[PDB]
């Protein structure tokens, strides 16, 4: 069983680190990005689901057969569904009734059971509250509580974090900076802890959609298209008085940016375009030659009837418009 | 440039090998499968596109900027689109006008240009013939000719083949057998060459849909749902008088089988369910305890409005019905 937990680490992590070179009005810059599609269900939330349940078993927090229950329509639902099944747990996912058939289908394909929450019945906030309710009534239940559970960010401190840190040292470079958009805060907290232990002067910045500057303002919640991040509150996991300044990207700018990365061979999700632009924002402010790291949480295959496959009206302040990708200068993997 | 070609090998291969244990009426059996979603565009045809173009540059068969042109709606289109862009070539894909918006979108997302071929204008056969025509008129053109190009199967002899062979020796096991469904024949020929060099008594069997026993009959072409394999002719690449007997799986049986693998945590495409069942057919005939290897070419995310997300009428001869997946007993990766 520690044999099982040991070998299954092999279905996650160890993803490519790419050096991307581009032209930014028009001087040549570069970003380093980890590509997280190279995982069991194609996102970074595989590293997190696996770890959450490995540690959970280690501390008797979950028993064989217990129901795993969470609120998402995104990769967390997917990651937990597939590892739940691998480890033999039932999985229940709670989500807003308005999710697309596309999403529901995927989560469902892994055995997980779908309970839709009306508008009304609380909506997204509803679904979170409905998970807690289920667990009061089924005490058996294991809740990942993805927005507050420390096991999430630890996942990234021990996993993608170590990886990032080493891949960069291996090019004899320091990390001057890291940016990641925040859904749960796990990535930016976990990786950011790890980067700071090795690169004491780096800047760890959390990313928010400029359309919904929840993190930078403390209250504002608005419609945005960057899936995976910036839900309608500040997750407990994320700790702003301990991070550097917040970066903010228009969802339009991001979409476009992800359009361009695909066009140069990297099919990614909208969040990945946001990170990229964020990473350049952070570069603009630390120095044209700083090393900036970010992540590409998933690939484009799920986003195929989203604004990602449509012309975006460009706007004056977008950075995407000034950016031209030249090449992939390097790929590491270890 | 041999620096570039060298580092980009890092965006493909080195995928997990899983030992799957299951119950087959009801005695316990096992299959080993390589999981090929863990690649740049999520399929096995990444290994092949990369290799085809690496060797092509090595032999001056393609020049910077030349247009890469091929006929597919599947992973080959996708793989070639994304590596073409990475390496700066234009890509044109020819496909039947009736392809779904879903497919077109994906191929397009990577920069590749879409020419649809009527029914009429030859259909699928049309599209192949239309690629040749384009290249008569644009002599510049690089054709992958995926159904006849030896560089395809070599890809798998040097790549997934080596990997398979070593991963199995590392468990102190011989390969008694391998099965792979045949679209181009690259997988089964390339891997099969490699397996035979190390496991001289293994059986290398090509897989066909029972609904369309083109390979076993020499002529029959019929409607089937297993995407990626058994188009409407026998590809030149595949060489039947040099392989073992053909296995044949109902597309319904396959679909179901892929339903079940997802439900146990492995989201796969229909072809992957076909391979699995094939692998068991081959096991039934060599001995309940033979080691059989097969491949899971891609994941389920593309197949999301296909018969994969619908109840299949079960039938007497299906093996899926008698199969119960217990667990993933092991995962290797090196
Ligand atoms: C979860 C997610 C994010 C954000 O990661 P957190 O660690 O949850 O902040 C970004 N993009 C996508 C696609 C995600 O699923
Ligand atoms: C191409 C493909 C196959 C068959 O592989 P060949 O080497 O072309 O025979 C099987 N499944 C899928 C999804 C494929 O794209
Ligand atoms: Cl700062
Ligand atoms: Cl035989």
Radius of gyration in angstroms for the set of CA atoms belonging to chain A, rounded to a whole number: 19
CB proximity under 8 Å: B 58-117 to A: 82-86, 88, 102, 105-106, 108-111
Contact assessment for residue A320 and residue A256, using Cβ atoms and an 8 Å cutoff:
yes
Cα A309 to chain center, whole Å? Answer: 21
The candidate with the shortest Cα–Cα distance to B287, out of B201, B165, B208, B195, is B201
In this structure, the number of other CB atoms found within 10 A of the CB of residue A233 comes to 13
Residue count of chain B, please give it.
Answer: 334
SS3 A267: coil
Contact assessment for residue B47 and residue B39, using Cβ atoms and an 8 Å cutoff:
yes
* Calpha distance B140→B136 (Å, rounded): 9
Contact assessment for residue B229 and residue B179, using Cβ atoms and an 8 Å cutoff:
no
* Calpha distance A182→A287 (Å, rounded): 24
Same fold, A1-38+160-313 and A39-146: yes
Nearest Cβ partner of A265 from B10, B86, B301?
B86
* Calpha distance B84→B111 (Å, rounded): 9
Beta strands in A138-278 (DSSP E): 177-181, 203-209, 247-249
Tokens of B69: 């042109």
* Calpha distance B176→B196 (Å, rounded): 10
Pairing assessment for the beta strands B323-332 and B17-24 based on DSSP bridges:
antiparallel
CB proximity under 8 Å: B 269-328 to A: 299-302, 304, 308-309, 327-328
* Calpha distance B24→B323 (Å, rounded): 5
The candidate with the shortest Cα–Cα distance to B257, out of B315, B204, B216, is B315
Which residues of chain A are within 8 Å of residue B105 when distances are taken between CB atoms? Answer: 304, 309
Contact assessment for residue A166 and residue A190, using Cβ atoms and an 8 Å cutoff:
no
Give the gap in angstroms from C-alpha B258 to the nearest C-alpha of chain A: 10
DSSP 8-state secondary structure symbol assigned to residue B93: E
Tokens of A193: 């802890």
Contact assessment for residue A58 and residue A28, using Cβ atoms and an 8 Å cutoff:
no
CATH number of B1-38+160-313: 3.40.50.1100
- For tokens 């008694």, the residue is B176
* Calpha distance B45→B152 (Å, rounded): 9
Cα B265 to chain center, whole Å? Answer: 20
Residue count of chain A, please give it.
Answer: 334
Contact assessment for residue B215 and residue B230, using Cβ atoms and an 8 Å cutoff:
yes
Tokens of B202: 């293994």
Contact assessment for residue A330 and residue A294, using Cβ atoms and an 8 Å cutoff:
no
Largest interatomic CA distance in chain A: 60
- For tokens 């129901």, the residue is A67
Which helix (DSSP H) or strand (DSSP E) does residue A48 occupy? helix A45-58
Contact assessment for residue B264 and residue A86, using Cβ atoms and an 8 Å cutoff:
yes
SS3 A32: strand
* Calpha distance A220→B4 (Å, rounded): 46
List CB contacts of B3: < 8 A, sequence separation 6 or more. Answer: none
In this structure, the number of other CB atoms found within 10 A of the CB of residue A158 comes to 16
List CB contacts of A61: < 8 A, sequence separation 6 or more. Answer: A55, A142
Ligand 2 in reach of B230 Cβ (< 6 A) = no
Q: 3-state SS string over B101-161?
A: HHHHHHHHHCCCEEEEECCCCCHHHHHHHHHHHHHHCCCCCECCCCCCCHHHHHHHHHCHH
List CB contacts of A110: < 8 A, sequence separation 6 or more. Answer: A41, A78, A81, A82, A84, A85, A91, B262, B263, B265, B267
Which string of DSSP letters, residue by residue, matches A52-120?
HHHHHHHTT-S-TTPPEEEE-SSHHHHHHHHHHHHTT--EEEEEETT--HHHHHHHHHTT-EEEEE-TT
* Calpha distance A221→A213 (Å, rounded): 7
DSSP 8-state secondary structure symbol assigned to residue B313: P
* Calpha distance B152→B50 (Å, rounded): 10
User: Using CB atoms within 10 A of its CB, is residue A52 exposed (0-12), middle (13-18) or buried (19+)?
Assistant: buried
* Calpha distance B90→B101 (Å, rounded): 21
Which residues of chain B are within 8 Å of residue A8 when distances are taken between CB atoms? Answer: 328, 331
Q: B22 — alpha (psi -120 to 50), left (phi > 0) or beta?
A: beta
**Could you tell me the resolution of this structure in angstroms?**
2.9
The domain ranges of chain A are 1-38+160-313, 39-146
Beta strands in B8-73 (DSSP E): 17-24, 27-35, 68-71
Torsion angles phi and psi, residue B83, rounded to 5: -70, -35
DSSP 8-state secondary structure symbol assigned to residue A207: E
Nearest Cβ partner of B8 from A82, A301, A331?
A331
Tokens of A119: 């508008």
Question: Between helices A101-109 and A75-86, what is the axis angle to 10°?
Answer: 20
* Calpha distance B90→A166 (Å, rounded): 35
Contact assessment for residue B319 and residue B57, using Cβ atoms and an 8 Å cutoff:
no
Tokens of B105: 């979108």
List CB contacts of A270: < 8 A, sequence separation 6 or more. Answer: A225, A226, A227, A228, A251, A254, A255, A258, A303, A306, A307, A308
Ligand nearest to the CA of B36: 2
The candidate with the shortest Cα–Cα distance to A49, out of A32, A23, A63, A68, is A68
Which helix (DSSP H) or strand (DSSP E) does residue B205 occupy? strand B203-209
- For tokens 């706007």, the residue is A315
The candidate with the shortest Cα–Cα distance to B146, out of B219, B88, B93, B89, is B93
Does A120 sit behind a cis peptide bond, omega within 30 degrees of 0 on the bond before it? yes
Determination technique for this entry:
X-ray
Q: List residues bridging with B200 in a β-sheet.
A: none
Contact assessment for residue A255 and residue A307, using Cβ atoms and an 8 Å cutoff:
yes
Going from the Cα of A317 to the center of ligand 3, the distance in angstroms, rounded, reads 20
The candidate with the shortest Cα–Cα distance to A211, out of A274, A119, A305, is A274
The candidate with the shortest Cα–Cα distance to B47, out of B85, B92, B83, is B83
Q: Ligand 1 site: residues with CB under 6 angstroms? A: A 43, 45, 74-75, 181-187, 227-229, 269, 271, 297-298
Going from the Cα of B205 to the center of ligand 4, the distance in angstroms, rounded, reads 7
DSSP 8-state secondary structure symbol assigned to residue A253: H
For the CA of B156, the closest atom of ligand 2 is: 7
- For tokens 């520690």, the residue is A2
CATH number of A39-146: 3.40.50.1100
Q: List residues bridging with B27 in a β-sheet.
A: B24
* Calpha distance A233→B87 (Å, rounded): 42
Tokens of A108: 């469902």
Which helix (DSSP H) or strand (DSSP E) does residue B181 occupy? strand B177-181
The candidate with the shortest Cα–Cα distance to A275, out of A319, A315, A307, A241, is A319
* Calpha distance A322→A181 (Å, rounded): 21
Where does chain B have alpha helices with state H? 2-8, 45-58, 75-86, 101-109, 123-136, 150-158, 160-169, 186-198, 214-217, 251-263, 270-286
Contact assessment for residue B153 and residue B178, using Cβ atoms and an 8 Å cutoff:
no
């Amino acid at each position: 069983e520690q044999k099982k937990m040991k070998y299954l680490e092999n279905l996650v992590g160890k993803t490519p680190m790419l050096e991307l070179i581009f032209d930014y009005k028009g001087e040549e810059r570069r970003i380093f990005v980890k590509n997280e599609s190279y995982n069991l269900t194609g996102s970074i939330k595989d590293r997190m689901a696996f770890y959450t349940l490995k540690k959970a078993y280690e501390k008797n927090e979950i028993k064989k057969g217990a129901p795993i229950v969470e609120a998402t329509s995104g990769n967390t639902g997917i990651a937990f569904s597939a590892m739940g099944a691998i480890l033999g747990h039932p999985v229940i996912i709670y989500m807003p009734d308005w999710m697309s058939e596309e999403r529901k289908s995927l989560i469902r394909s892994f055995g997980a059971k779908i309970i839709l929450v009306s508008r009304k019945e609380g909506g997204f906030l509803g679904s979170i509250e409905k998970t807690k309710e289920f667990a009061k009534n089924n005490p058996d239940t294991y809740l990942p509580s993805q927005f507050s559970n420390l096991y999430n960010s630890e996942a990234h401190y021990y996993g993608i974090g170590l990886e990032i840190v080493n891949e960069m040292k291996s090019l004899n470079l320091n990390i001057d900076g890291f940016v990641a958009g925040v859904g749960t805060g796990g990535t930016v907290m976990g990786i950011g802890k790890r980067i700071k232990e090795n690169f004491s002067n780096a800047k760890i910045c959390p990313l928010e959609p400029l359309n919904s500057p929840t993190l930078s303002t403390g209250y504002k919640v608005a419609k945005h298209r960057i899936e995976g991040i910036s839900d309608e509150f500040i997750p407990d996991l994320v700790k702003l008085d301990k991070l550097d300044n917040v970066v903010s990207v228009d969802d339009g700018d991001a979409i476009v940016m992800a359009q361009k990365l695909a066009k140069c061979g990297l099919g990614v999700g909208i969040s990945s375009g946001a990170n990229f632009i964020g990473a350049l924002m952070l570069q603009n402010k630390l120095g044209k030659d700083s090393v900036i790291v970010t992540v590409f949480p998933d690939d484009n295959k799920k986003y195929l009837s989203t604004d990602l496959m449509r012309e975006e009206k460009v706007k004056e302040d977008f950075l995407s418009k000034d950016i031209t990708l030249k090449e992939i200068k390097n790929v590491l993997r270890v």
